Design a protein around this ligand. Sequence first.
Ligand SMILES: Cc1cc2nc3c(=O)[nH]c(=O)nc-3n(C[C@H](O)[C@H](O)[C@H](O)COP(=O)(O)OP(=O)(O)OC[C@H]3O[C@@H](n4cnc5c(N)ncnc54)[C@H](O)[C@@H]3O)c2cc1C
Ligand code: HEM
Ligand code: HEM
Ligand code: HEM
Ligand code: HEM
Ligand SMILES: CCCCCCCCCCCCO[C@@H]1O[C@H](CO)[C@@H](O[C@H]2O[C@H](CO)[C@@H](O)[C@H](O)[C@H]2O)[C@H](O)[C@H]1O
Ligand code: SF4
Ligand code: SF4
Ligand code: F3S
Ligand code: F3S
Ligand code: FES
Lengths: 239, 239, 520, 257, 127
Amino acid sequence: MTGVLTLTRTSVGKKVIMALTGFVLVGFVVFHMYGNLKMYQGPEVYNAYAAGLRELGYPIFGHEHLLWIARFILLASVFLHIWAATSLTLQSRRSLQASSISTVRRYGQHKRQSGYADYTMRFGGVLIFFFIIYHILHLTFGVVGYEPGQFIHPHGDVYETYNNVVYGFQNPLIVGFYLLTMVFLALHLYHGVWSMFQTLGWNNRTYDRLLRGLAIVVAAAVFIGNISFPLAVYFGFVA
Amino acid sequence: MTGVLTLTRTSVGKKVIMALTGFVLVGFVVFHMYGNLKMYQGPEVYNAYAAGLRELGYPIFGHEHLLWIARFILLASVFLHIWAATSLTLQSRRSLQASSISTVRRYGQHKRQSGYADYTMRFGGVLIFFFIIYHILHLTFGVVGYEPGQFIHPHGDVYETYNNVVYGFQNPLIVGFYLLTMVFLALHLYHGVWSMFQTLGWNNRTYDRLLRGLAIVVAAAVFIGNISFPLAVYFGFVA
Amino acid sequence: VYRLAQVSVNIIDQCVAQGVPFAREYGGLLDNRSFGGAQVARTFYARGQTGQQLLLGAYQALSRQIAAGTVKMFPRTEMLDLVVVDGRARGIITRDMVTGKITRYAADAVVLATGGYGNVFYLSTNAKGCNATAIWRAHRRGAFFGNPCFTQIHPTCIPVSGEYQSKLTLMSESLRNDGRIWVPKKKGDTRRPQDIPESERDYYLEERYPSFGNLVPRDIASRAAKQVCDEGRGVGPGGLGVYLDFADAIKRLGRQKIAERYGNLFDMYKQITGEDPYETPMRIYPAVHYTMGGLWVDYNLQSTIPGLFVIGEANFSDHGANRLGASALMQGLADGYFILPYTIANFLAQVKPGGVSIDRPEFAEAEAEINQRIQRLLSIRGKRTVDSFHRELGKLMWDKCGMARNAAGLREALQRIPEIRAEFWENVNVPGEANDLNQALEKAGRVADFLELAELMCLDALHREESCGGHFREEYQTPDGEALRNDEQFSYVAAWEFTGDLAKPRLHKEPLVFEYVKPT
Amino acid sequence: MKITLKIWRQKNRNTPGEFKTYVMDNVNPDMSFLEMLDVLNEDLMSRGEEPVAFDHDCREGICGMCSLMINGVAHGPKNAITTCQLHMRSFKDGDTITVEPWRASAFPILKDLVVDRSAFDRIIQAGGYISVSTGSAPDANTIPVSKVAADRAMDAAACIGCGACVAACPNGSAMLFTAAKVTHLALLPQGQPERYQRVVNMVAQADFEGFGNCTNIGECAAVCPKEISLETIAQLNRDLVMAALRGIEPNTPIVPA
Amino acid sequence: SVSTGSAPDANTIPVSKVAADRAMDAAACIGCGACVAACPNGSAMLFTAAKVTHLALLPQGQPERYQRVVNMVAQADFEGFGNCTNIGECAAVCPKEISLETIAQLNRDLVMAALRGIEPNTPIVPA
Ligand SMILES: Cc1cc2nc3c(=O)[nH]c(=O)nc-3n(C[C@H](O)[C@H](O)[C@H](O)COP(=O)(O)OP(=O)(O)OC[C@H]3O[C@@H](n4cnc5c(N)ncnc54)[C@H](O)[C@@H]3O)c2cc1C
Ligand code: HEM
Ligand code: HEM
Ligand code: HEM
Ligand code: HEM
Ligand SMILES: CCCCCCCCCCCCO[C@@H]1O[C@H](CO)[C@@H](O[C@H]2O[C@H](CO)[C@@H](O)[C@H](O)[C@H]2O)[C@H](O)[C@H]1O
Ligand code: SF4
Ligand code: SF4
Ligand code: F3S
Ligand code: F3S
Ligand code: FES
């Protein structure tokens, strides 16, 4: 009747929406890690990349046009992801609340043969939401975790993202929080890359191991790339 | 049960692999001819194009990243082409040795009524392999067919490919070898452009003549451009 | 029989159309196989679970009807009595086994599909919950029992592992094709079965009945196995069972083909027994599988009591004295689909709807009787358990009224039965309360019904002075060992009428006349 | 073989339950777990205590009546078997064995180890069938079915409805059962005309019955007695996506009587 | 793979006239082997393609087409025949004028059979 909106009605439709959003978010995360890998080249290359992010197709497209479209798409995707994850978690909690030996335990001696994704995915998602809020409030705006007169706002057409990065990862608490979030995000990707393919139905006997290996390698690469930066900045390798 | 790897077991799968690889290689050859057509505009335009080939996505992507990806794809495709072509040629040769009247010929006489692709494709392929192994070593590296102090390696972000081209096609033997290779490649394309479409199964009553005409025009354009380059370089039209 | 054979084709078509995954050939059409001795390949099968697929299709149809609201389903409840009003079966009295509530239901017609009564013996291939309460109550109310002594056995079954198990897994009959049934010559041997030399093995069924070719009928082989096990030459942990060796078959044939033909059976045996059949010999012991007897019905599938229809395994139906393989499911589906609707529509059209509610005195009397019986059973609180009485009754029935029946043994069993019934009614112990999930009460009721029914079935076995089908009498056998019929005197169906005395049931004879297939 | 057991005991649906410890000295290694429980119940009856109640009909792993969580893994430590098929030769002398029923909101507890599984019946009633009538069937060999499709449908259809997938899944979801039924009915031509509706209805019924969502953990297929693989879930997901593309609206839920 | 006596009614499955005509065109192969001798590679591609096209254009051949072609193709590779260069002598020499499109059809089927993970069976060893 309504059409696509029918996915809102059932749990499997919510999972499909979550899988599409996870596709988009995984693509964005991989692209962001690849872009942030350029900070090893030097301040000039990193600043040029940051400036050119705002000038995609400058002769054709206007200033900060594609970037704003990407920002809006990411915001909508993350909002849908949060809503679907909260709804499914509440549904599962209600499904397990009635028959449990205790308010904190369901079975007396349950042993899971498979993974513990139910815990890792949820806790990593909550931590990722909090870290995304802190990161947006920390590096893009520069109004937290910064000594006064250290964060340089983008003036005109020049950018000082290299200086902001080098002055950001100085507090040990900040780098520890970043490392913990990166570990949780690594686990989240390691599960979700295969989970989204399974949810959409693009899985068979032949491609299961291939998809699992792709998830493993993507998660490992993302984790290594994301944890290289804070340690390098804190230890003075990048200055 | 492996999946796509089943294509390696049968001859038809090898032909399909060859068709895909030939599609990629034909695209690359057409793009390369179109790019090399710029040398008529002058040394500045040719040098700018050569420099910009490396800086494909410089504002976003890294230096030589896309070029290296294309190089790897081309190398893998050409290796698969060589392997499959050699295997198919050996298998077809083994199918005639048992009953041929002589080691040189099958029948006393045999009036072919449809074409001579069996000789043309194989001989042109081996000549193209030798020409590629010489070309990469001649123009990209400049360590053969060059007087000392003539080839200028790319130093920094400046390229002298126009000078290397104008100093390369000077030996009459080199230009004759290039012309013979281009003739053989013209025949190779004239057959293979339609052959790959037939192999992949995209053919019927309606599209056969259109595919033949497309193959004819593609081969003619490639041949014309790739023989106009070295002849004009040698005759002094481009200096 | 002709009606069943005629409607079998529609049975198969309806089963196929419902989505039953029957075995298919490579071209897309159905596949058929022979049923281990039949001269034609007329059997449609799933891989190993044809009955499961057929029941799943029927249950899917029933669920579709339930969703439409036409059919109301009551799981976890059992019928305890039948209410007859003005000579017509007009209701039932049931007990909800979860809460213990007693409910009265009234309807224009009552249909019984409660299955066979093969669980009267303690050891059988039937399910744990199979019983004969409903059919016995119907017979007590006035229904006639047709040939209760006709029971079918199965040759290959897993023997028991002690005095605690009452379920015997049904092996396929595809085994024993190599013969090789043997028992060690020494009564007690501690050596491994494969360590016994071939010359030291008392290979019975080979030196005895040699003309058949070690492929004797299941009746003779099962009787010989029971005789060997009763003599004290058993091989199982409890002294019950016989050895079926496959070493000679493995050596003669190729292991790959034997595996491809017996893999599921070998895996299930290794899961249950714990021994690989490839190396160690199998242990088998025949057990009772089917009951051809049941309530007598006419051409309209209607019992003696008007308004009461008996279908499925609960009636005598048309299986005679021996049920052919892959026929019980066909008969049940025929009765359910293409037979019962017509007769029930005719009967309902001959009468008018309604007129009877659950406030009638008959319903109250039946409910009071059920409540008093339950209270008495719960208040006996003796010493012996229900399982002990059931095991004693089953052992007595299997020893006397089993595969080999003689006048002296049947008379001894008939004398013994009332003492066992009195001991059960005086010294049984069931715990719990009536209004709870008490399985012991249900088991006690089923045991009481079995005790009542065993006397009648033994009386019927004694009355029939001939050997035919499953019912075998030692005094009327051919010298070869087969069964000898007496068509001049016993060519009829014996229906037993409950006269109120469990030892004096009236006998009615329904003559059988054959016009197309002559006896031979 | 001396065995100590910790059995969950509950008087009724609303009465709270607790674990009870029973030690038995002589246990035959070759006898099954259910026979061991029967022996324990007989001993309790002889002593005078209330026997332990559990579900058991076939003792062959076909009916699906058995439902027991042993040592935290459904249907005992061994896989691809049911509770009735588990024997005592798979355990060790002196081991402690924990017995308890399924735990789910949709599976109310009625006794010590007996649970209600009518939610599966209600799920089946919500379109999980083929709406054909009696007597209207065409000839059996009318519609050809490929052997591969028939084999896959038979593999998916061999579900005993034990409910172990619900009790093993950390979310307590019935995704494996619904996926198996949908895959069985959608791989045959006879189920083609109404598959896209059917799955949606079934899925909605699950969401109405109180089952959780699916996180693709995979614990369900690890303890499934009949080895229903995870491709059924992928098939169900594909069918649901295709139905949503077609604008299929779920019907009203099946309200229990 | 249809056994004798299990056939349904003739008019049960309708077949379009165009499909029937194409199947008849592909099926009219006398098995002379002229395509093998005329082909410079000495390949039996036209014969296999004609058989596959004839058996794949009818509904009765649908349930087992994707396996069938692979098996047939494998058997050809096992028998010693060459590969197909798409030259075209087979059609120009074939007595019954079987078009080259059958080969394309075969190719398509094989590609599809490659996508679904179909593996060829054991080759047919001559007695
Ligand atoms: C291991 C085994 C293998 C078999 N193989 C074959 C074979 O290959 N071919 C063949 O033809 N036959 C075979 N049979 C026999 C066949 O299964 C039965 O004979 C037949 O299915 C019985 O039909 P039914 O309708 O009575 O079903 P049943 O299941 O026997 O009917 C019993 C039903 O009635 C209910 N019920 C019973 N008592 C009560 C009560 N008091 N109150 C309420 N409900 C009650 C039960 O809950 C159940 O739903 C086999 C049997 C077994 C045990
Ligand atoms: C761990 C290493 C990371 C580094 C070094 C890093 C670095 C940066 C920097 C410097 C900015 C500000 C750019 C600017 O102001 O011009 C930024 C913005 C951003 N980062 Fe990150 N980031 C990291 C991880 C992540 C991750 C894991 C995510 C995704 C969850 C993410 C999402 C974003 C977003 C959404 C923005 C805002 C983009 C915009 O406003 O255009 N970052 N990042
Ligand atoms: C860095 C950004 C994120 C990415 C790339 C990401 C990616 C994914 C992917 C690919 C999946 C698998 C979806 C599927 O099974 O089909 C997933 C599942 C999930 N994500 Fe995220 N996620 C991100 C952030 C979050 C956030 C912010 C939350 C919530 C706070 C969250 C909570 C979850 C939950 C709960 C699930 C699983 C729910 C279920 O399976 O039922 N994630 N994620
Ligand atoms: C300039 C690069 C090349 C291009 C663009 C190219 C393109 C093609 C194409 C499109 C085909 C038709 C494939 C089909 O029938 O499906 C083909 C066939 C063939 N090529 Fe190449 N090719 C190239 C280089 C080579 C090389 C280096 C060799 C071997 C030394 C070679 C040997 C062959 C052979 C033997 C065939 C025919 C195989 C058969 O028909 O069974 N080619 N080529
Ligand atoms: C016929 C006239 C041709 C001319 C004048 C020509 C000229 C050149 C030049 C100047 C380069 C160096 C590009 C650079 O350094 O950025 C080059 C590279 C190359 N040419 Fe050619 N070429 C010709 C034909 C061909 C043909 C027919 C092929 C393949 C069939 C080919 C394959 C290549 C490849 C693979 C490279 C390496 C590109 C790279 O490393 O990025 N060329 N050619
Ligand atoms: C990388 C560029 C340089 C390439 C260098 C090597 C070129 C030559 C490679 C070896 C040539 C022979 O290649 C080999 O051919 C045989 C048969 O001919 C193929 O063999 C396979 O296909 C044939 C027919 O298609 C089947 O009959 C056979 O059973 C199967 O194994 C092998 O899969 C391939 O490895
Ligand atoms: S899917 Fe497996 S675990 Fe779930 S009910 Fe069916 S048989 Fe049991
Ligand atoms: S030439 Fe034509 S008719 Fe002869 S075998 Fe080949 S395909 Fe058949
Ligand atoms: S455990 Fe749950 S996540 Fe899926 S595989 Fe089973 S329904
Ligand atoms: S001409 Fe020869 S190469 Fe193949 S397509 Fe025909 S048999
Ligand atoms: S008794 Fe049937 S599965 Fe256990």
